Structure formats: C-alpha cells, structure tokens
C-alpha cells in the first residue's frame, strides 16, 4: 500500500529563455475514487516555503502564469515551462493525493547552466541579479541556524549534568 | 491575507513528545481542511497529517499512525499536531498548510518549525567545573563551522556580484 513518485531529471540546468520540461512517474494508478487524478506540482525557493502551482495535472493555481503547463496520462505525468524566468528557479516537487498515503517525488532543481560563471550572467538584468543575491540569504540562515541547533543538541547534557549539580 | 505561524518546536530525546501549534490568521478556519507536512534535512518533503475541516475526519500515513494526533481548535483558530514516541527519522522542519476540500491539498504553507530528535548523559556526571569549560570550548567550534558556511556563500555570492559591477 504505496505508491512511488519518481522525480525526473534531478537537475535541470537552462539558460533564461528557454523551454524547461520536468517528468513524474507513479508507480501505480493514481485516479481518485471520485474519478479525478489529484497530481499537483509544487516549487520551494530556496530557504523558502512550497507554493502550489499546479493542481489535478493540468489546471493552474492563481497567480501562476501562462508559462507554466501541466499534462498527464496515467502514470507518467509532466511539468512544462515555456520560458524559464529568474522567478522559476527552484526545487519543484510533484505530488500525489489520490491513494493514502498520500506521496511527494523527490524533487527536480531547475538552475541556472553555468551561472556560476559571471560571463554567463552578464545577459541578465541588474533587477533579477539582485534578485539572486537576495535568494541566497535564507539558504545561508537555514544552514547556519542547522548549525546552531546541532550545538544545542550538543549543550543540552553538560546543562542537564549542570542542572543536577 | 492568509498567515500562518507555527510553534513549538526544539529539542526532545528519543521516545519523548512534543507539541506543535500553528496559529491561523486571515480566514475562515473552520471551512478549510488542515494538514501538517515535514521536511526532513535532506530536503525530502513527507505528508504528516490531515484533519477536516470540523475535525471529525483524520488521516495518517503509516508512519506516524499511533504515535502522531493531529486535532484542531475553529474557535481559537489553532491547529495542534501532538508527537509521542518520537524518533531519530522525525528531526525535520514541519509546516502547516491550508487545504481546498475537493481540488488541492497543499495552498498556502507557514514558516514553519524545525524538530530535532536529541540522541551520553552517563559519563558527563562528574566535575561540575570541568562541563562549565566543556560547554564553553564547544563555542569556537560553532563558530568556525558558521564562518565555513558564511565563506562558502561568499564565494557563491562573489559571480553576481561581479555581473552586476560589469554593466
Ligand atoms: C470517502 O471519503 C469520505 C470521508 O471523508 C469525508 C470528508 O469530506 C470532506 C470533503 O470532501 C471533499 C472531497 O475530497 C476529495 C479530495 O480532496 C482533495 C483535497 O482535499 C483536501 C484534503 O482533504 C482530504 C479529505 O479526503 C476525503
């Protein structure tokens, strides 16, 4: 009793402009017992939460735009970006909510192909390079806050070995 | 608009437990079904619980089924995820997430609150000063290893950066 979402490619890497199209399998029959597919799509800036983007395959959640595309037909279902922007990078994620337990794939990362060479994002705007350099600040506060709640795990017996004392 | 905040997560040894509360804001609460979902440190995303929209309906995976209960509150506008047993595969950050009942599951998701399984305590009763200079040499360790971090997003910074000082 479970159904496996397999993710595909695990990394993406395209350049600004161009189309983007990411797979997702189910392992099993994914139809609803009211007779719909719930395969949704999700994408998590980095350091930031999931936001719902597509919903049952192929409808667009308000406040997607146009760009973005779903379609299905059974067990192999597809996320399409007609024109990858700055704002579409990101981890996304399908989902299934058709068969308890209800199941997420394993994530496909859509980035930038060699930006972290500069030559490679001289063709980018001054507004989305700032853009970028600001999405990198909850990365760095959630891998450094990671830290910190190791060396909490790390305190906590010499204060309970205090604490007795 | 639509806010959630999530509480109540730290530290807790395994086989202890621990409650969550995500307090909603901007919305019926009582027409909404609510659900919690985790993500574990390697960026793995787990569906936790689900509760109704009254709360006469649950759902649990297999997973969690015994050890987690999810419940909710419509007149403080509180949804509560309670966690018995925990072990070493629930240390993850978890975010409670709003529903449409009938077309999606997952619409608009908190910050959320991170829960780390503490896994040692036998061997530390003794000197009482000898754990004050302990617990204080484990200080520049977290620094350095915070310093590695914030260098390693220097390097990754120093690209745009120099992309944007080139037009
Ligand atoms: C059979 O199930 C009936 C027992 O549960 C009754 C609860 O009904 C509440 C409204 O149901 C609407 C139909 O739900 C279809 C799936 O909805 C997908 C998004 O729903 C958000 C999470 O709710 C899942 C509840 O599962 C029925």
């Known amino acids: 009793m479970d159904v496996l979402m397999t993710q595909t490619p695990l990394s993406l890497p395209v350049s600004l402009g161009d189309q983007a199209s990411i797979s997702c399998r189910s392992s099993?029959?994914?139809?609803?017992?009211?007779?719909?597919?719930?395969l949704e799509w999700y994408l998590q800036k980095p350091g930031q939460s999931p936001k719902l983007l597509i919903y049952?395959?192929?409808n667009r959640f308000s406040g997607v735009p146009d760009r973005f595309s779903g379609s299905g037909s059974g067990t192999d279902f597809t996320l399409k970006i007609s024109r990858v922007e700055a704002e579409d990078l990101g981890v996304y994620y399908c989902?299934?909510?058709?068969?308890?337990?209800?199941?997420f794939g394993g994530g496909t990362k859509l980035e930038i192909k060699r930006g972290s060479d500069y030559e490679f994002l001289k063709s980018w705007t001054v507004e989305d390079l700032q853009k970028r350099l600001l999405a990198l600040d909850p990365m760095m506060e959630q891998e450094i806050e990671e830290i910190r709640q190791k060396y909490q795990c790390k305190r906590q017996p010499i204060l309970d070995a205090i604490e007795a004392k | 608009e639509v806010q959630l905040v999530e509480s109540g997560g730290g530290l807790v040894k395994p086989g202890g437990s621990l409650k969550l509360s995500c307090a909603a804001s901007?919305?019926?609460?009582?027409?909404?079904?609510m659900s919690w979902v985790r993500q574990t440190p390697e960026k793995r995303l787990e569906w936790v619980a689900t509760?109704?929209?009254?709360?006469?309906?649950?759902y649990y995976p297999d997973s969690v089924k015994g050890r987690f209960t999810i419940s909710r509150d419509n007149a403080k506008n509180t949804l509560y995820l309670q966690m018995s047993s925990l072990r070493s595969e629930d240390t993850a950050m978890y975010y409670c997430?709003?529903?449409?009942?009938?077309?999606?599951?997952?619409?608009?998701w908190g910050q959320g609150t991170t829960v780390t399984v503490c896994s040692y305590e036998f061997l530390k009763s003794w000197t009482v000063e000898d754990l004050q200079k302990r617990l204080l040499a484990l200080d520049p360790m977290m620094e350095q290893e915070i310093e590695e971090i914030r260098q390693k997003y220097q390097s990754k910074r120093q690209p745009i950066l120099d992309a944007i000082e080139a037009k």
């Open positions: 997430a709003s529903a449409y009942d009938g077309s999606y599951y997952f619409d608009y």
């Open positions: 901007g919305f019926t609460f009582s027409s909404y079904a």
């Open positions: 509760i109704s929209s009254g709360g006469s309906y649950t």
């Open positions: 099993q029959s994914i139809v609803h017992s009211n007779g719909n597919t719930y």
């Open positions: 049952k395959v192929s």
């Open positions: 989902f299934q909510g058709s068969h308890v337990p209800w199941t």
